[PDB]
């Protein structure tokens, strides 16, 4: 991008009679800065001289006067043609640090060739030296540092969602520049910029809050989706185009089974629903085998969406286990477990 503005005027000698306006143009890719100075000397004459000083974070690349390269004669002299509505353009390479950049000028016109020795630094000395128009001014502006640092995503290691339920999580994006490319900030699986096979219901949105992005990760999980886990990525881009994780890094991480910044495991779990009818037993803390089986059957009945394929080895008897004290362990097809206390649905028939 190119940014154009009018710099801060540090001083402009009120006896000066040349400078009308000064503008800057900065290319954020080349980091070249052009100072454009428009001149209307009262005495145009034949020769323009420009004594130029720049801050140490700049290095001069080009100086033109009236559209032609200036002859190169802390302060350096450049000379060229003198016309009305003359344009002096000083292009510098800004260093990677950027920051405050400064320009100082002492300008003259003359009918004679101009030399640095015979160049007046005050209005009162003009008549005996260059004997034409004169001006003196200083400017500054501020240039961003070159941003070579990637943005950082903060997202949980695991985002756990439940079949039949909605979810909402946030990832946060921070960058050293405090500026982003929202269009190139996404949540995706590895292969393409999409939510991914099996998780097509994964949604996201990107908002900027202050100096950070907030990436809302949300959706509605179907009752009929596969239980297990999926690797997904928050990929964020700063305003300079640096990304937290590149496509090639995502691919290496997928093969090596390592992590990149912004990676998360999306885990789809089952949400166990409690029996609506109390399971009556003799001693809720010392169940018989028949009572353990009543507990398993009640859990199956209240969870008709828990299919055999959803539990370990597609077997309800080994996938739903019930301890002596009525604790139910459900082990799913992915090896994940729920350990569920029976206190809220198992009761004694004594006193019922
Ligand atoms: K950055
Ligand atoms: Na933006």
Author numbering: 246 to 318, 326 to 604
Task: Give verbatim excerpts from the published study on this entry.
The serine-rich repeat (SRR) glycoproteins of Gram-positive bacteria are an expanding family of microbial adhesins and virulence factors. Three of the SRR proteins (GspB of Streptococcus gordonii strain M99, Hsa of S. gordonii strain Challis, and SrpA of Streptococcus sanguinis strain SK36) bind human platelets through their interaction with glycocalicin, which is the carbohydrate-rich extracellular portion of the platelet membrane glycoprotein GPIbα. Among the best characterized of the SRR adhesins is GspB from S. gordonii, which has demonstrated binding affinity for the sialyl-T antigen carbohydrate decorating platelet glycoprotein GPIbα. Binding of these SRR adhesins to platelets is a high affinity process, with the interaction between GspB and glycocalicin having a KD of 2.38×10−8 M and appears to be a major factor in the pathogenesis of infective endocarditis, since the loss of GspB or Hsa expression results in a marked reduction in virulence.
Here, we report the high-resolution crystal structure of GspBBR, both alone and in complex with the disaccharide α-2,3-sialyl (1-thioethyl)galactose, a precursor to synthetically-produced sialyl-T antigen. Our analysis of the structure further identified that GspBBR contains an unusually modular fold, prompting us to re-analyze the sequences of the SRR family of adhesins. While still predominated by β-strands, the C-terminal subdomain of GspBBR does not contain an Ig-fold. A comparison of the structure of GspBBR determined with and without the disaccharide did not show significant structural changes localized within the binding pocket, which suggests that it is pre-formed. We determined that other structurally uncharacterized SRR adhesins also contain modules within their binding regions, suggesting that particular subdomains may be included, removed, or interchanged, manifesting in the broad range of binding partners observed in the family. Importantly, the structure of GspBBR provides insight into the binding repertoire of other SRR proteins, and specifically highlights which modules mediate binding to host carbohydrate receptors.
